[PDB]
Each structure stands twice: as C-alpha cells, then as structure tokens.
Amino acid sequence: TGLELLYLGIFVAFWACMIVVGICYTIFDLGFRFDVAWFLTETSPFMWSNLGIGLAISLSVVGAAWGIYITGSSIIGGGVKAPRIKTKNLVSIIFCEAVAIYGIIMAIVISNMAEPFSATDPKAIGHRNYHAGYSMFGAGLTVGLSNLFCGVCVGIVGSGAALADAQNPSLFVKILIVEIFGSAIGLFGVIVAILQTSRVKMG
C-alpha cells in the first residue's frame, strides 16, 4: 500500500501542522495575523470564479467518464456471450454521458457570469463582486461534485444492469429505474447550481 500510505502520511503531516500552528497562534495572540478575512479578500474573485467553472465542467466529465467505463467494461464482457446486450444496455452509457451534458450547460452558463473589474482595492471591488466570485466558485463546486457522484452511481448500477441482462433478457427494463433515480441526483445538483448563480453579477 505504498502510494496510499504516502497520501495518508502527507495528510497527517498537513493536519498536524494545521493543528499545531493554530494552537501556537492562539497562544501567542496572533488572531490578527491569522485573519481569514485577508485571505478571502485578497484571493482575487477571478480565481474563485474560474476554478469554479473549470471544476464545473471537469468534475462533471470525470463522473461521466468514470461511470462510462465502469458500465462499459461490464457491457462488453456480458455481450461476449450475449450479443443482444450491445444495443439495449447502452442506455447506461447514455445516462452516464448526460452528466457531462449537465457539466457543459452549467459551465457555459457560469461563463456568461464573468466580467472584468478595473479595480484592485477590496473596497472598490465591492460586496457584489466578491459575492460573485464566491457564488460562482460554490455553484461550480456543487454541480461538479453532484455530477461526479451521479456519474459514478449510474456507472455502477449500469454495470450491474448489463451483467443481470446477460443472464435474463427481461430484467433490464425494470432495473433501469435505479438508473433514473441516479440521474435525478445530478439533476438536483444542476438545480442547486442554477439557483446559486441566479442572482450573481460581476463588473
């Protein structure tokens, strides 16, 4: 378990550093130095917005592809002895890809929210503008991960569906209900992202 032990080690080291540094700053009275406000304010809103969009598309694509191959491996393997599978169980693939479709829709929608500032001072940038940054970042994060999880879910259930179909033709049309419910989660993510961006304006 080499690389996982590495990730665990770096994680433990990072959070040990966080804990100790927190205790030391509090004990030394450096709450004025440690003010999260400065971090959140001087990190430019553009960075938030654009990480937001990039994740919005990319995490959605990750979910789509992950689920895609999870179910495709099964679809192929079962199809080996069950050629009927290839046309029918492809609905698993299509429902996986719908996640990346959502990814684009929200990514481009958010991209329509961005505009320059011509301001550097936080006071000049303003509440509206900083809110635009954080809101775009959050909406992107939300859509991206909801899509990711919907995708992995749909892929897994679709793999199960293809394997089940391999043994009986009739079951697939019924198991697909679980696939529909899986897609519903991604749709919820899309809705939440829409609401989050609905009242956002850079400029």
Binding site: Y134, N168, L171
Partner: protein, 150 residues
C-alpha cells in the same frame, strides 16, 4: 454594512448541503442497485419490492435539495457574517448527515436485498431498518432547517 467577504460561508453552506447530500444519495443508490441487480437474476419476482431502498436514498437527496434551495434563496451579497455561518451550519448539518444516512441506506439495502433473496420474511424488518437509517438524515434536515431559519 456587513463585511465584503461575508457571503462566502453562506455560499459554502448551500454547496455543502447539496454536495454531501449527493454523495450520500449516490452511494446509497449505487450500493442498493448492485444488490438489486445481483438479486434480480435469482428471484425476479422481488424487483419492484426491492426497489424501495433506492427510494430512501432519493429521499436523502431530497432532504439535501430542500436545504440547498433554502440557503440559495436566503443568500445575498450583503449577509451578516453571523447568518453566513448559520447558513454554513445548516448546509453541513444536512449534508454530512445525509452522507452518513446514505452509507446506512446503501449497506442496509444491499445486505437486506441479499437476505430476502434467500428468505422472504426478512422484508419487513429490512423496511424497518431502512426507515431507521433514513431517519438519520431526517434529524440532519431538522437541525438544518432550524439553523437556517434562525
């Protein structure tokens, strides 16, 4: 007026609600779904009965969505830092709660579907266990509603 950076935590509250709820619902759905798929070939007469756990996972997802919508509507560019923290609290409360609930629904659904495949009488007990598992997310939803509305 309230500080410029305040709205960040409210944004995160909405996002956390939806995202962690989605994680929970996705796991529950996928686990119950693999269980259902494996069971179907054996005892095809039980599919439409065995679905229910996926509906419970969807219920967790709905729990997430409700809170997320509430925070989204409550959110504005000039919220007080206090209300922003409270929105984040509501979001995390429903979200992580839904995640735990989702792991519960997934594992219980898988095991119970597998059992009922072998022994029908387990069904009602499985429903009861599923209810108690979703009840976990329900508690998170209650606390989140209170935090948000306060």
């Amino acid at each position: 007026n309230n500080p410029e950076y305040s709205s960040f935590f409210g944004v995160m509250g909405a996002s956390s609600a939806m995202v962690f709820s989605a994680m929970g619902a996705a796991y529950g759905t996928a686990k119950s779904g693999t269980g259902i798929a494996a069971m179907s070939v054996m005892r095809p007469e039980l599919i439409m009965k065995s679905i229910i756990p996926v509906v419970m996972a969807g219920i967790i997802a709905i729990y997430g969505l409700v809170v997320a919508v509430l925070i989204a509507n409550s959110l504005t560019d000039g919220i007080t830092l206090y209300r922003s923290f409270l929105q984040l609290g509501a979001g995390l409360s429903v979200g992580l709660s839904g995640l735990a609930a989702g792991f519960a629904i997934g594992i219980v659904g898988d095991a119970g579907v597998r059992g009922t495949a072998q022994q029908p009488r387990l069904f009602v007990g499985m429903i009861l266990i599923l209810i108690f598992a979703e009840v976990l997310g329900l508690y998170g939803l209650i606390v989140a509603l209170i935090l948000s509305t306060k």
